[PDB]
Design a protein around this ligand. Structure first.
Ligand SMILES: [Mn+2]
Lengths: 612, 161
DNA sequence: TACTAAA
């Protein structure tokens, strides 16, 4: 008699959290026939009637897009037929999870279905897959009323969840058929270009046999940055500085090394004249004195891009390795969700409670105990994106429980969190300016007045420098030696992983869960090889591939087509244009590029001959 | 008269040859020193100049330059910034001006920050050096207290390239 | 045999 309402979330953690919020603590939770997706049951009032609530979670995209079997054989049909004469269906991602069968079995008798997926894009696609899977299972509607309900929320809070339960909406088919079109375009471009490339280049050169040449709307733009950096390094003409420096002795054993105000001159004759006006002199006079107090701003909340950047730069970890370590930590229940964009702590976040967990560790015993006595500084106001709260420590840990890989990532997360709550570093800057003849010189130093987040992140510290001697205007000191420094301009170094992530995020090439994969893809396909300092070095195969792309059609490497084609697809989401025309038109424009690619492939082959 | 106009230019500071000054004169009619100066300013100095720079200036045999003198600027390059990055702010601006008179070319350096002369100054512009100028190592030292830009309307040859 | 991008 008791009707049942099924709810579905996008992850087990969100499922459990929402079930706990709704049920007031009356969970009845058990694993399903997956081992990774659970089912929580309770009772409530829905549409003014006492019913049962059953809630579960999918594990991401239930389904993905793939051609039929025949057109996957790579030889029956040329890639030219993939654009228009190739049907596409949907298969299951992670077939070991049996998620489609799980949603089949859970739902037999659920009169109403309620949805709790994320409000961003790539959530409407998942919700419509879940609907298309579960609809032929439920007990229909006895009357003419409705059953399918979509719930919209911005953050995991009691008030937001209650409001989302109060007001109920509907799924957006127009928004789903934008990510659907993007998936179809990605497949039909990156599977019609890579086949031609690996059947043309592998069919002529023996050194490239049994090797894969891949093209994609993200992989090739990612390689473009490294190739551009390599081009800038290769085409560089060093010049010749001429910097003049001086020494001043105050009393004894204190020789201040000055710096030129005109920091450089690109002329030997001018440098020689300036030396000649200075070296035959033996007195320097003070003219200025500044004791301005400055401050170093504490870091914001940890984001996934910042975590990957710091893991690459300092911890010496690759992006995918760092992501896997963070995922293992989150699954084990130590840190919270490691794929975010937010940088603002929510209002209800129990900072005092979470910071009390690390009150016994030997590394932070002094800092945490102090910070809990004179009050905690409020976190910096950063950015909010409606995603999960930032990566913060959730349970106590020690080097014994964790390994040599997860502990280091945990150490940075629990140190970045404390620095976000502590004070700022207030350092007093003292600058003294002398006058050795007509020219000017200055000396600067820093002294720390009250270290803040420095004591928890020692690597981001104001360096220890000797205090400047006391001197007011009108004091004269003896002069030592003055000479030129024939420095030379140095070429830029190769592209690092940290710098690439910023470049990736600026142009929106990849999402938070796709940045590590794209960087790994170009490193596992011999396009780019890693080196010391986590630097990316383009290889011979990568250099010839991107350079040939510029000669043929620059609209395949430029880091603007991916953002631009997404803007065109937003027209379907906003309802201005229908699904068929935009996909049909954007497929036709890419069909002309492929035919222009095949007829001009000899332009790229000329470059490969020198390489291989 | 022609002699009166020549004398007037003589104390004005312009030093131009006889061919140049009969070139600047519109006609043997009533022409004022103002229009003579304007016409000369328009014309390129390399064809109207005289031999008034003391010569050997590129060497160290000359100490200082006196009197109000009119000179033209050929090339301006920022010696505090590299060729590739001509707008870098890592160094204060400091310009080297190749300064011609039509016969002998000297080199001047910006010793104190000016505002009138900039990198976007058309070649052929003229400056006046009234005051005392220091010739240190064969280089003129330009200060805001002895340099006055008089503008210029000459056929541009750079065209931003 | 692969391919593409993404939760
Ligand atoms: Mn999302």
């Amino acid at each position: 008699v008791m009707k049942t309402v099924l709810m579905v979330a996008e992850k087990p953690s969100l499922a459990q959290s929402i079930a706990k919020i709704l049920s007031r603590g009356s969970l009845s939770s058990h694993k399903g026939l997956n081992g990774a997706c659970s089912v929580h049951e309770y009772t409530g009032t829905f549409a003014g009637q006492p019913v049962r609530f059953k809630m579960t979670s999918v594990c991401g995209h239930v389904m993905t897009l793939d051609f039929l079997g025949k057109y996957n054989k790579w030889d029956k049909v040329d890639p030219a037929e993939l654009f228009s004469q190739a049907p596409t269906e949907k298969k299951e991602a992670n077939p070991k999870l049996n998620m489609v069968k799980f949603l089949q079995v859970e739902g037999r008798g659920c009169d109403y279905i309620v949805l709790w997926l994320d409000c961003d894009k790539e959530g409407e696609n998942i919700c419509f897959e879940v609907l298309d899977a579960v609809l032929p299972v439920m007990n229909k509607a006895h009357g003419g009323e409705k059953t399918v309900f979509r719930a919209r929320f911005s953050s995991i809070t009691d008030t937001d969840i209650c409001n989302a339960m109060a007001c109920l909406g509907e799924p957006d088919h127009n928004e789903a058929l934008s990510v659907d079109a993007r998936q179809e375009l990605d497949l039909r471009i990156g599977c019609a270009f890579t086949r031609f490339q690996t059947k043309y280049f592998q069919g002529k050169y023996g050194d490239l046999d049994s090797s894969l040449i891949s093209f994609g709307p993200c992989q090739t733009p990612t390689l473009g940055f490294c190739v551009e950096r390599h081009d800038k390094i290769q085409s560089f003409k060093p010049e010749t500085y001429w910097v003049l420096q001086a020494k001043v002795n105050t009393d004894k054993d204190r020789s201040l090394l000055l710096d030129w105000d005109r920091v450089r001159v690109f002329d030997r004759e001018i440098a020689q004249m300036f030396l000649n006006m200075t070296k035959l002199e033996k007195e320097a006079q003070v003219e200025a004195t500044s004791r301005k107090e400055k401050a170093k701003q504490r870091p914001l909340a940890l984001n996934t891009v910042e975590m990957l950047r710091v893991a690459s730069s300092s911890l010496g970890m690759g992006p995918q390795h760092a992501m896997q370590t963070a995922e293992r930590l989150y699954t084990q229940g130590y840190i919270s969700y490691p794929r975010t964009e937010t940088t603002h702590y929510p209002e209800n976040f129990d900072l005092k409670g979470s910071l009390r967990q690390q009150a016994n560790h030997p590394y932070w015993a002094d800092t945490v105990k102090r910070l809990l006595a004179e009050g905690i500084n409020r976190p910096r106001k950063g950015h909010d994106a409606g995603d999960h709260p930032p990566i913060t420590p959730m349970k106590s840990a020690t080097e014994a429980e964790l390994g040599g890989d997860a502990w280091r990532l945990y150490e940075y997360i629990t140190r970045h969190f404390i620095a976000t709550v502590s004070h700022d570093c207030k350092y007093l800057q003292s600058t003294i300016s002398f006058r050795i003849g007509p020219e000017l010189f200055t000396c600067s130093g820093k002294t720390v007045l009250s270290p803040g987040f420095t004591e928890v992140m020692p690597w981001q510290s104001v360096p220890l420098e000797e205090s400047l001697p006391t001197c007011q205007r009108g004091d004269a000191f003896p002069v030592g030696e003055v000479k030129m420094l024939e420095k030379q301009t140095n070429p830029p170094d190769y592209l690092t992983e940290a710098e690439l992530i910023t470049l990736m995020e600026k142009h929106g090439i990849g999402t938070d869960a796709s940045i590590p994969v794209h960087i790994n893809n170009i490193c596992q396909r011999n396009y780019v090889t890693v080196e010391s300092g986590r630097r990316l070095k383009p290889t011979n195969l990568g250099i010839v591939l991107v350079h040939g792309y510029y000669k043929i059609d620059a609209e395949l490497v430029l880091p603007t087509i991916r953002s631009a084609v997404e803007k065109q697809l937003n027209l379907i989401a906003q309802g201005k244009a229908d699904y068929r025309q935009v996909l049909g038109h954007t497929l036709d424009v890419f069909k002309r590029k492929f035919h222009y690619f095949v007829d001009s492939i000899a332009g790229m082959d000329e470059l490969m001959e020198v390489s291989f | 008269m022609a002699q009166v106009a020549g004398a007037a230019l003589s104390q004005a500071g312009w030093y131009l040859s006889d061919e140049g000054i009969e070139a600047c004169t519109s006609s043997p009619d009533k022409v004022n020193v103002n229009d003579i100066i304007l016409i000369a300013l328009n014309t390129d100095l390399r064809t109207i100049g005289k031999k008034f720079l003391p010569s050997d200036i590129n060497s160290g045999k000359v100490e200082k330059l006196e009197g109000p003198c009119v000179l033209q600027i050929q090339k301006i390059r920022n010696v505090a910034a590299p060729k590739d990055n001509e707008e870098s702010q890592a160094a204060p601006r400091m310009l080297r001006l190749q300064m011609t008179d039509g016969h002998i070319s000297c080199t001047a350096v910006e010793f104190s920050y000016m505002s009138k002369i900039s990198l976007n100054t058309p070649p052929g512009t003229k400056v006046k050096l009234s005051g005392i100028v220091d010739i240190k190592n064969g280089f003129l030292l330009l200060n805001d207290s002895n340099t006055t830009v008089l503008g210029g309307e000459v056929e541009h040859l750079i065209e931003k390239w």
